[PDB]
Paper text:
Ric-8A is an ubiquitously expressed cytosolic protein with two main functions: it constitutes a molecular chaperone that allows heterotrimeric Gα subunit biogenesis and additionally, works as a guanine exchange factor for Gi, Gq, and G12/13 families. The structure of NCS-1 consists of two pairs of EF-hand motifs, of which only three are functional: EF-2, EF-3, and EF-4. The structure of Ric-8A-P bound to NCS-1ΔH10 can be described as a coiled region followed by a short helical motif (R1) that is connected to a long helix (R2) through a loop.
Three different peptides were synthesized starting at residue 400 and ending at positions 423 (P1), 429 (P2), and 432 (P3). The crystals obtained with hNCS-1ΔH10/Ric-8A-P2 grew using microseeding techniques in conditions containing 0.5 mM Ca2+, 100 mM Mg2+, and 100 mM Na+ (see Materials and methods section). hNCS-1ΔH10/Ric-8A-P3 crystals grew under similar conditions to those found for Ric-8A-P2. The structure was solved by molecular replacement, using the Ric-8A-P2 data set (Structure 1). Crystals of Ric-8A-P2 and -P3 each contain one complex in the asymmetric unit and both the 2Fo-Fc and the Fo-Fc electron density maps clearly indicated the presence of electron density corresponding to two helical segments (R1 and R2) of the peptide that completely occupy the NCS-1 hydrophobic crevice and protrude from its surface. The quality of the data allowed the unambiguous modeling of Ric-8A-P2 residues 402–429; no density was found for the N-terminal residues S400 and E401 and the density corresponding to residues S402 to R405 was very weak. The greatest differences are found between Structures 1 and 2 at the N-terminus of the Ric-8A peptides, which make few contacts with NCS-1, and for which the temperature factors are high.
Numbering used by the authors:
A (entry chain B): 6 to 176
B (entry chain P): 402 to 429
The structure:
Amino acid sequence: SKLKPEVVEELTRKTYFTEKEVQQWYKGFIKDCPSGQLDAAGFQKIYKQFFPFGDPTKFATFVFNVFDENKDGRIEFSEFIQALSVTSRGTLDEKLRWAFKLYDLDNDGYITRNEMLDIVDAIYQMVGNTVELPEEENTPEKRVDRIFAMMDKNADGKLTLQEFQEGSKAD
Amino acid sequence: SVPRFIKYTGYGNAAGLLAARGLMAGGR
Ligand SMILES: [Ca+2]
Ligand SMILES: [Ca+2]
Ligand SMILES: [Cl-]
Ligand SMILES: [Mg+2]
Ligand code: NA
């Protein structure tokens, strides 16, 4: 597991990681994925180990496809470390810009309510929901209805990145 | 106790945290 100096330097420059951190992530990545290419089955295995009695299939697939930047069916280390940099160390706006890319499942530039529900449902399917009374049931649908309406300031049934980014930010 | 972050489910932050944690597991 030896990363070429030019590659390390370039990946350091492109991320929030130091050169030392990049090389440490590479050693660990190659230890767990000796070929240097993480496939979708291996990615889902990670989440099944977290949540062995949920169903991570949907969430893993959605996130894998965003992480697989060149859409060759594999997460290579350059994709791994750049995805980890943004999701773990980005500013709030950068993290939400990444989340926008995840939620905009048809890549048409807007989040529609069906897309928001698909992600939220994928999350609950994996991790579970909070136990409530049958009459305050924590359903993704009612949660999404609330949040989506709050975010859709112009009520056109679709969320821009600007509308999405302002969702939890205080004014 | 509700998982502290799941209050952000649908806002983007929960998906980001779960994505990051899966990557981290994939490198450890
Ligand atoms: Ca790829
Ligand atoms: Ca869309
Ligand atoms: Cl989320
Ligand atoms: Mg469409
Ligand atoms: Na809108």
